């Protein structure tokens, strides 16, 4: 059966050396959300002021819109736009991008 099983080994108590001070809540926003959606929402819009209201475990600052990217994704299932996996596991490691602003040919 699942769960924790484990070995008969030692671990005694964690310990990371390098970054400190970092959130990175596993999703945990969401949870914030819903927590407080279910709590209160006395409001024309409880899912702004919602935010405003657990703002800290993210970002302490204004973004309703990305509050509904988020909302938006998690109220629904269904979505085969995003695709692979591999930025979460232990190394933390930047990459290049793409962004169009001057292309001509002529």
Known sequence: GPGSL?????????????????????????????????????????????????????????????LYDHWRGTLRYKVIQQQGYRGKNSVAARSPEKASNMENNE
């Not at 005694?12 to 209160?40: H, M, N, P, W």
């Not at 209201?53 to 204004?62: F, G, L």
């Open 6 to 66: 484990s070995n008969f080994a030692n671990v005694g108590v964690g310990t990371s050396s390098g970054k400190q001070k970092r959130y990175k809540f596993s999703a945990s926003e969401d949870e914030a959300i819903i927590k407080g959606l279910a709590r209160f929402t006395k409001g024309q819009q409880r899912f702004q002021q919602i935010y405003y209201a657990y703002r800290s475990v993210w970002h302490p600052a204004r973004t309703v819109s990305q």
